[PDB]
Ligand code: HEM
Ligand code: HEM
Ligand SMILES: [Mg+2]
């Protein structure tokens with residue numbers, strides 16, 4: 737069941753956005769446009785460039801971001817990963 | 826100049842890695858060294874051999890790879906396609 741209020745992106749569409757002109761990334765089943773965040777990230781640009789257009793959930797959690805960082809991610813949230821591209825829990 | 830965190834490859838060079846000794850492939854503007862991946866590819870070696878050395882984004886996405894297949898590709902990423910060789914738009 738897709739949610740009328742949410743815009744969904746297939747991982748194929750996220751994979752296209754892997755350039756400095758447009759960088760998207762998936763974190764926990766949600767899509768973030770970090771294009772403008774790249775030069776402001778306190779963890780630097782490179783870690784984000786390397787996984788541009790991809791699901792970087794594991795790296796994000798391995799680093800262990802703070803509640804403050806998670807709060808900050810909300811400003812870049814743009815949609816949910818299409819139901820079909822979500823993995824079983 | 827470009828981005829020093831990125832090694833760039835011209836499609837002319839990528840095209841030469843089309844045998845089992847060294848097979849590279851392009852997916853969404855990035856180069857992947859699949860030489861060790863061939864044996865382990867669930868869809869078999871032949872489908873990779875067929876587009877070895879070329880951009881196989883279309884066939885990759887048309888097949889419908891899973892989130893796990895995408896995660897798996899990351900370890901083979903060696904660099905980006907030279908900007909001159911990408912689509913103009
Ligand atoms: C919109 C998503 C993201 C936001 C808002 C964000 C935000 C931040 C912030 C605020 C910090 C400072 C320390 C703290 O608050 O925990 C930080 C550090 C860091 N971030 Fe992120 N980050 C994001 C995504 C990522 C991703 C996807 C990666 C990995 C590919 C990453 C890798 C790092 C690293 C390596 C550090 C350094 C911390 C350490 O020394 O271990 N971040 N990030
Ligand atoms: C780094 C590049 C690639 C990786 C890591 C990869 C990985 C995988 C994995 C893990 C599967 C199992 C099903 C799934 O998880 O989706 C799979 C299946 C398959 N792959 Fe690939 N693949 C790659 C490139 C390609 C390319 C370029 C082609 C086409 C020329 C291809 C054709 C197939 C086919 C036909 C299947 C079977 C589909 C099924 O019924 O699930 N793959 N691949
Ligand atoms: Mg060499």
Ligand SMILES: [Mg+2]
Pocket residue numbers: 791892893896
């Ligand atoms: Mg994953």
